[PDB]
Amino acid sequence: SYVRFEVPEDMQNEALSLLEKVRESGKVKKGTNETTKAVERGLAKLVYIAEDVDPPEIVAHLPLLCEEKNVPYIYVKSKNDLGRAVGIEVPCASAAIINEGELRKELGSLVEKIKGL
Amino acid sequence: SYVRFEVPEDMQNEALSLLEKVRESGKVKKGTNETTKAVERGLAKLVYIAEDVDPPEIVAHLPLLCEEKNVPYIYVKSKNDLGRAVGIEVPCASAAIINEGELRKELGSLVEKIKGL
Amino acid sequence: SYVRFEVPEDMQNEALSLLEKVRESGKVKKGTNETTKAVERGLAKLVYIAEDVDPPEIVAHLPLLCEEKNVPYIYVKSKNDLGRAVGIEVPCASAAIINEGELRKELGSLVEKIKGL
RNA sequence: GCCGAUGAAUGCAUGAAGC
RNA sequence: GCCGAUGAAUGCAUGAAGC
RNA sequence: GCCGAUGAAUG
RNA sequence: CAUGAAGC
Ligand code: NA
Ligand code: NA
Ligand code: NA
Ligand code: NA
């Protein structure tokens, strides 16, 4: 689909777990509208995009945009899992990390692992 | 009606305030069904009957039963107010106090005011 | 799956024919709830279990129990056919023969063919 | 939101009707 | 027509939840 | 319970 | 456009 590279589930789980952790020591935007706004304003440190989005055009612009902004993005399998990770009661098509908090190093590890694809 | 005497509203509010006060340090049975059971078993110390109960036949037996069991009963105007007094979320057609808790003396005063009719 | 032996469709049709014929001179329990109670009460002479039960935990306990109660059980293909055989309007997951009626000998032949498996 | 002491869930009995 | 033995109407125990 | 980040209430 | 978890 609108997917520009495959992502290992090891990495996926690493990322989602990091997203939960950032929620308490950092800042996160959740939902495509917020995330697009964040990337546009150049606040996004790592953006998450779910792969099971129907219709696709809802997240279709996000990979293209992140790459023009040279903002790292990473894909995850289910929007349900991303909804759970940002701490909401509904599925979440995309999200983003805006302020890392204390997790300077973990996020460094993860974004570096993402370039490797 | 099934009403055998009018009750000064002073007496009524004293009764209701008493009932909330008992809810937490003593024992109260709520609903016509539980109430009738308490009276039948000789456990009821004071029963409350709402006057606005329709159909009346739902609480009609309670006065007569109390009188053959020598249980003091008192009438109150609204079942809504009685529900609120026993701390349930719906109106309550009748209720009963089974264990006075610490509020022995006030209960004496109230039953005495009831005898006065 | 709860199926503990294969049953020849020859035997299955025999058993269902016997069940239709008894529902008229004997007694039959129909539906898992009733049938289980009948087995637990030690009244069941033969229990029928449909194989196409979804989810299986509805009838899964029945073999173990019949085994504890020394009750013969026999398996059949469809819950619809079992519903039809006990004479009801909906599919039937399990049933039991409680009183053989006139069919002492036939029910004996059938329980015998069942030991052979 | 709705529903519930004018009796919720539940338990036990029942077991083909209900709308 | 829909629904129902994968349990309808129901009786009783019970008493604050259920959706 | 239904609904809601595929965006609630709102401005 | 702004805001972003409630509303019923
Ligand atoms: Na035996
Ligand atoms: Na069929
Ligand atoms: Na029941
Ligand atoms: Na009932």
Residue numbers in the entry:
A (entry chain G), B (entry chain C), C (entry chain D): 1 to 117
Give the original sentences from the paper that presented this experimental model.
L7Ae is an archaeal ribosomal protein that has attracted recent interest in terms of autoregulation. The L7Ae family of proteins selectively bind to a widespread structural motif in RNA called the kink turn (k-turn), which has recently been reviewed in depth. The k-turn is a motif found in duplex RNA comprising a short (usually 3 nt) bulge followed by tandem trans-sugar-Hoogsteen G:A base pairs. A recent study has shown that archaeal L7Ae binds to a putative k-turn structure in the 5′-leader of the mRNA of its structural gene to regulate translation.
We have solved the X-ray crystal structure of the complex of the A. fulgidus RNA bound to its cognate L7Ae protein. In the crystal lattice, three two-k-turn units adopted a triangular arrangement, with six L7Ae molecules bound to six k-turns. L7Ae places its recognition α-helix in the widened major groove that is splayed around the outside of the k-turn, and places a hydrophobic loop over the L2 nucleobase. In the complex, the RNA is folded into a standard k-turn conformation. The A:U base pair at the 3b:3n position is not a standard Watson–Crick pair; rather it adopts a trans conformation with a single hydrogen bond from A3b N6 to U3n O2.
